[PDB]
Amino acid sequence: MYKDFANFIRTNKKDLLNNWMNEMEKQSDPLINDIAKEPMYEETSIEFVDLIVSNITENGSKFNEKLDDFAEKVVHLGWPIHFVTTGLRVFGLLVYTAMRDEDLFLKREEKPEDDAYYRFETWLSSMYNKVVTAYADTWEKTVSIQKSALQELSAPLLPIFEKISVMPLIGTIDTERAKLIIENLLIGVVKNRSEVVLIDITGVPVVDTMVAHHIIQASEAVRLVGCQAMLVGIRPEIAQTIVNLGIELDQIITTNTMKKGMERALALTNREIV
Amino acid sequence: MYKDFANFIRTNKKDLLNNWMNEMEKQSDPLINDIAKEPMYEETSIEFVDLIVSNITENGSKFNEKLDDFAEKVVHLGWPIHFVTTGLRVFGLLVYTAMRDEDLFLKREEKPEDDAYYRFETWLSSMYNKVVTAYADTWEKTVSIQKSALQELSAPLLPIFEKISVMPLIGTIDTERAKLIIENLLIGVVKNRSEVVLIDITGVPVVDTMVAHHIIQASEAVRLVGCQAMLVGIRPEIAQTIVNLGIELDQIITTNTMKKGMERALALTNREIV
Amino acid sequence: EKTVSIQKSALQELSAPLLPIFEKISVMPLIGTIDTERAKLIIENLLIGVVKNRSEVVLIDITGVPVVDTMVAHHIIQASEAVRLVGCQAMLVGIRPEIAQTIVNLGIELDQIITTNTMKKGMERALALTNREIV
Amino acid sequence: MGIPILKLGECLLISIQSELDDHTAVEFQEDLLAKIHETSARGVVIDITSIDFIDSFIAKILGDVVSMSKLMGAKVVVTGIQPAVAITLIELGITFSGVLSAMDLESGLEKLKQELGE
Amino acid sequence: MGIPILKLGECLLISIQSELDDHTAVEFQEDLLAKIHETSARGVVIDITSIDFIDSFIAKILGDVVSMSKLMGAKVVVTGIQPAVAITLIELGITFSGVLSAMDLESGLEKLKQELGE
């Protein structure tokens, strides 16, 4: 029941204000004091904790949106799950102290029982559950959009010469990225007619054995389509690793920089000198 | 104190097993049953909850590493902060039921008091705090590395012609990305000598007013360095938006596709036809 | 209602036919009196087609429309600017004196639009722009 | 039935449309060998456009065909082996597979014509 | 003191190394005007390599110099206005700033030579 729960929250708000007073000392007092002045944080906290049970015992959609807004605000303000968990712990601690002192539970009785005694904690855990549920929505969404952008940015076949298709491949790549690159390169060479694919391995800091093996597989694959693979821009450590892999390197034609490699490619396709 | 706390955890483990039995019904029973068989999850949970207080009342580094491993395992298994919070709530509920039934607290007395009564909940909140602290480390690290990769992949000036510097610009961009692009383009044109910069706006789905204004600023900036900006690959909606912006478009030389735009650029630098 | 709807659809599809095509040249004849929604349809169809069937120049046959509104003329000029931005000259063809007067009174700047009074002159000038296409 | 052997110019053209595993593979092998033995054409051209899925058996049989009719004349696998089947061919049928022309049968015919003319 | 006016060929060369705000700006203005009025050179060349920070006053004064000596002869701002100062010049000194040569003073001299020869 939510009515007398709010009628006791009208003092539990002061209890939680004292709770914030006690808790400010342990976790980044200067940082929180600088980024958020104390009165507005206190009034936001009492607003979050007082109108949750102002509805008739069931739920509230408007306060659900308010709780989601509070979750995103504490995400932006610099309160991760650790800080919110500390807040819940100190909430419980000061509720314990207040009930040891105030001694006024929900139902009218000379000596209440365990029922409301733990209904309080169940409702505390429920509001914490809703808060943590609203906490991670924006984080998951931004992780997903960043992953999608990284996927679409990994293998740009858009840079295109006349009948030649270069490929930047600047960022560091892993196994997932390697599969994405091989797939995208084959798809791009299928859709667009070309004869030379200029792969720029320049840009990747360190390449292990298996990624280099996939790169050689990509070169052999575009050759087996029927387009020469003029891989360009090899760095020292990556060359050491490729040659230590033991894979044959006679079929791959290499060049130090894009200008010279594409000049050699235009030499290969003689009638593309102009 | 941790000794008799473990001597009562030796039955609170069965209590929490019954807790898991009760809680499996509400949250994705088929999914959790399929991904993780019940006995191993139960033994992992009792291992997590039983050896935490096996040290002498102070702490444990080996079990701290074990708790971090448990946090990463429940992250990978599909238990976000909402599921862990539900687990904490049901932990408290079944501890309440057990103490209502078992009635055996830390200190030897005919009728214990509130001290251990709430020391139990404080320790529960503390282990939950450590769990949530270990929860977000990998997530923050992967967010940071994804952001860094997205930053370094946004504006690749690496694709380079002879005295011409093309720029893919395939993915969608925002204000932060716009600032990154303008900065990187200027830095790249400073380091490398060139005369024509081929910007490929082809690839971005939708461009608002301000990003288009920054693109025009980038064109004017590379012109004011002293290199012609032959912006290429304009789509219909983005052109509509650019022209609706009202910015002057006479200074920018445009082309439909890279091959033709670079052919026009080589026409501009006459002695680069070969 | 069904026949009204299908007839409106027919007028929708008969608005801006880019189908008339020459070698790397396009022309979009429009002859019925146009309105704001029709102007939006024309600009959308012109841009989408010129992207789909990429050609160097585009001829707009304004000849045929008696009178156009000032906002419609402004949108036509914006379409010319946009298709130039894509990389296609908007060689407007055969503008009537009344529409010319309306465009002049509009006060928008009028240098980038290339105009010829007949389709033959516009076609020969377009072939001049693509120098070796004239043969 | 599924092996349309065509002779045009001083060449030979083939299009593949069966994608079956054993029976079509062996019948195509035998028909191609019999045709190339019957009519003497320096260049034979094979199409793999219709196919998008190949196991080990077909890849080995195709490499065998390459060696087979290379023992009597040059050839091109004109049609670009699709990405999935190309990857499978690399991982299992490790070879250069003769001369190739990458999906443009006009390009393959032109290449074979210029190779035979010289 | 900070305005090394050089005359070479049929041109004029300047290098900027003060980066001060008011005094150096005005003295450079007056010295450049007096030199271009004294000696008649069709092309004047200005260097901005040393500078990496410019406020509104210097940008306006530099555009004023461009107009100033453009009223008596063509010019090039040969040295590539650095990215920060280039952005500041765009956002405040909105103009094309004459002919430019992008950090290669040999390129600027060659461009001015070929412009004067024709």
Residue numbers in the entry:
A (entry chain o), B (entry chain M): 1 to 274
C (entry chain A): 140 to 274
D (entry chain q), E (entry chain O): 1 to 118
What is written in the article reporting this PDB entry?
The stressosome is a pseudo-icosahedral megadalton bacterial stress-sensing protein complex consisting of several copies of two STAS-domain proteins, RsbR and RsbS, and the kinase RsbT. Upon perception of environmental stress multiple copies of RsbT are released from the surface of the stressosome. Free RsbT activates downstream proteins to elicit a global cellular response, such as the activation of the general stress response in Gram-positive bacteria. The activation state of the stressosome is reset by the removal of phosphates from RsbS and RsbR by the phosphatase RsbX, allowing for a new round of phosphorylation.
Here, we determined a 3.87 Å reconstruction from a D2 symmetrized cryo-EM map of the stressosome of Listeria innocua (LiRsbRS) assembled from co-expressed LiRsbR and LiRsbS proteins. The stoichiometry of RsbR:RsbS was identical to the one described for the Bacillus stressosome, 20 LiRsbR2:10 LiRsbS2. The 10 LiRsbS dimers form two hook-shaped strips along the core (f in yellow and orange color). A pentameric plane thereby comprises five triangular faces, all of them consisting of one RsbS and two RsbR dimers. LiRsbR enters the STAS domain as the linker helix (ɑ0), while a beta-strand (β0) is found at the N-terminal end in LiRsbS. ɑ3 is well-resolved in LiRsbRS, while it is not resolved in LmRsbR. Interestingly, the MS analysis on the phosphorylation state of the SEC fraction used for structure determination revealed a phosphorylation of Thr241, while conserved sites Thr175 and Thr209 were not phosphorylated. Close to Thr241 in LiRsbR, a spherical density was assigned as phosphoryl group in accordance with the ESI–MS–MS. The phosphoryl-group brings Thr241 in interaction range to Thr209. The superposition of SpoIIAA and LiRsbR revealed that due to the interaction of T209–TPO241, ɑ3 has moved towards ɑ2 in an ‘up-conformation‘ compared to the ɑ3-‘down-conformation‘ in a non-phosphorylated RsbS.
